[PDB]
Design a protein around this ligand. Structure first.
Ligand SMILES: O=c1ccn([C@@H]2O[C@H](CO)[C@@H](O)[C@H]2OP(=O)(O)O)c(=O)[nH]1
Length: 190
């Protein structure tokens, strides 16, 4: 791998697309971790053969993980962590063992407070239209590099909503670099 995509999701928006059934994310008001995805030549590396998920290796992080990395779609946090490890984490296991991988995601979340970086500039979430350039600009000013913005379009109204924010890191997992791909248009609701 040559870099990482640290992906955070906005729970209310994610769950807004679940028009049927329960969705725990509907009641959260902060960005939470979706995943830490190793990258290679502009694409995500997935399903690499590696070690099976072992909860005992991250037992010391259970408090932080239940708070910062909850499953927002269903009430089963461990299943989500196991899925993320098997699908993404194994691809960077040559340098980051399971414990280090989850610790890395936690440290990244604690050091990349999106709402805190937007609130002062009147760019916090309020269900109104935001500019892609403005949001990327505020985050670049605070963190030093451009983030990636990901959006989803509502099937009924065709309105675009911000659902995830990506912070791009070099292969060392600590050096921030500019992201280069957005799925958001010029404007979206946030
Ligand atoms: O909080 C969350 C956010 C996303 N997911 C993803 O959706 C699929 C549900 O079975 C899960 O497989 C997982 O897929 P991922 O996008 O890699 O594919 C959750 O389960 N919980």
């Amino acid at each position: 791998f040559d870099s990482f995509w640290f992906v955070q999701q906005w729970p209310p928006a994610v769950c807004s697309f679940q028009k049927s059934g329960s969705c725990p994310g509907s009641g959260l008001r902060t960005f939470t971790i979706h995943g830490l995805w190793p990258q290679q030549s502009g694409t995500s590396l997935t399903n690499c053969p590696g070690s099976p998920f072992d909860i005992t290796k991250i037992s010391h992080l259970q408090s932080q993980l239940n708070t910062l990395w909850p499953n927002v779609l269903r009430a089963n946090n461990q299943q989500f962590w196991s899925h993320e490890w098997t699908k993404h984490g194994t691809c960077s296991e040559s340098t980051f063992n399971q414990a280090a991988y989850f610790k890395l995601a936690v440290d990244m979340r604690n050091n990349y407070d999106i709402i805190g970086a937007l609130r002062p500039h009147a760019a916090g979430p309020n269900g109104r239209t935001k500019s892609r350039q403005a949001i990327k600009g505020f985050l670049k000013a605070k963190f030093g590099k451009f983030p990636g913005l990901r959006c989803r379009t509502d099937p009924q109204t065709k309105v675009s909503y911000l659902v995830q924010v990506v912070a791009c890191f070099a292969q060392d997992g600590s050096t921030l670099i500019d992201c280069t791909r957005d799925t958001c248009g010029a404007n979206f609701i946030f």
